[PDB]
């Protein structure tokens, strides 16, 4: 048969992610890493698979691997913050979401209103957690 | 958020 490139396995994992085939997507991204472990986005994308599968420690670890390879990554900070939010690490989550916002502004990139919306939601959850 | 968009973006 054929052994794909790492880029081809990333694209395959992306397709699987869009179809809620989260373990299969994560395994694909793992095969991309086996081919080229120096590409941050494979880890970021796999981190979101792990978050969807409720494997929070694995998602955090992949975010950390991505940030060691690309400390400027908006997506890695955004996913890290979203993971931390689910784990109720509110202050860290908010700081990571805010860092994603600042990096997106510095890099002149558009992610929708996704980051300000995530921030609003995170702050709401944090405040409710304290008051209860 | 639009996680699918975030995942696929080549940025
Ligand atoms: C809602 C929506 O479409 N958001 C969104 C997220 C990400 C991106 N692009 C990248 O992440 C590179 C565009 C739009």
Numbering used by the authors:
A (entry chain A): 21 to 152
B (entry chain B): 6 to 16
Published text:
Here, we report a general and rapid method for discovering α-helically constrained (Helicon) polypeptides that cooperatively induce the interaction between two target proteins without relying on previously known binders or an intrinsic affinity between the proteins. We show that Helicons are capable of binding every major class of E3 ubiquitin ligases, which are of great biological and therapeutic interest but remain largely intractable to targeting by small molecules. In addition to possessing increased stability and membrane permeability, Helicons are capable of binding large, flat protein surfaces that are inaccessible to targeting by small molecules, and Helicons have been developed to target a range of PPI targets in cells and in vivo. Characterizing Helicon-E3 co-structures and mechanisms of action, we identified new binding sites for α-helices on the E3 surfaces, as well as potential probes of the disease-linked E3, WWP123,24, highlighting the generality of our approach against this therapeutically important target class.
We performed screens of the naive phage library to identify Helicons that bind MDM2 and CHIP. Among the resulting hits, we validated CHIP-binding Helicons H317 and H318 from C80, including by x-ray crystallography to examine binding to their E3 presenters. Surprisingly, while Helicons H317 and H318 belong to the same cluster, we noted several differences in the co-structures with CHIP, reflecting unique conformational changes and binding surfaces revealed by the Helicons. For instance, the side chain of Glu9 in H317 directly interacts with Lys30 of CHIPTPR while Glu10 from H318 does not. As a proof of concept, we selected hit clusters for the RING/U-Box family E3s CHIP and MDM2, including those exemplified by H319 for MDM2 and H317 and H318 for CHIP, and designed focused libraries by fixing the conserved binding residues and diversifying the surface-exposed Helicon residues. Screens with the CHIP-based trimerizer library identified several CHIP-dependent PPIA clusters, including C86, C88, C89, and C94. Helicon H326 from C88 could promote ternary complex formation between CHIP and PPIA as shown by TR-FRET, and this was abolished by unlabeled CsA and diminished by the CHIP-binder H318 described in Fig. 3c, suggesting that the complex forms via the CsA-binding site of PPIA and the H318-binding site of CHIP. As expected, an unlabeled YAP1 fragment could also disrupt the interaction. Finally, we confirmed that while H321 and H322 do not interact with TEAD4 alone, they did show weak binding affinity to CHIP, at a higher EC50 than the CHIP-binder H318 characterized in Fig. 3c.
